[PDB]
Amino acid sequence: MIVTVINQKGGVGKTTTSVNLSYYLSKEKKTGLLDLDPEGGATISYGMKRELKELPLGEKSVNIFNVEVFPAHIGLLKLELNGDVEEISNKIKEIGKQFDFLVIDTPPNLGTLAISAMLVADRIVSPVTPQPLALEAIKNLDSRLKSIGKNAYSFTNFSKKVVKLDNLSSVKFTEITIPPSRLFIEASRLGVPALRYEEVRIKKPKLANYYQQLAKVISE
Note the residues at the interface with Mg ion (CB under 5 A).
15, 41
Give the integer Cα–Cα distance in Å for 14 and 178. 13
Q: Which does 197 bind (CB under 5 to 8 A by kind): a second copy, ligand ADP, Mg ion, none?
A: a second copy
Does 200 engage in binding with a second copy (CB under 8 A)?
yes
Q: Is 11 annotated as a binding residue?
A: yes
Residue among 39 and 51 whose Cβ is closer to ligand ADP: 39
According to CB under 8 A, which residues from 22 to 61 bind a second copy? 46-49
- Residue of the chain from 63, 66, 169, 181 that contacts ligand ADP (CB under 6 A): 181
Q: Which helix (H) or strand (E) holds 125?
A: strand 123-128
Structural contact between residues 106 and 8, judged by C-beta atoms closer than 8 angstroms: no
Q: At what angle do helices 207-219 and 14-25 cross, to 10 degrees?
A: 80
Q: Which does 49 bind (CB under 5 to 8 A by kind): a second copy, ligand ADP, Mg ion, none?
A: a second copy
Beta bridge partners of 142: none
Q: Is 181 annotated as a binding residue?
A: yes
Give the integer Cα–Cα distance in Å for 149 and 138. 16
Binding site for ligand ADP (CB under 6 A): 7, 10-16, 41, 108, 157-158, 178, 180-181, 184-185, 188
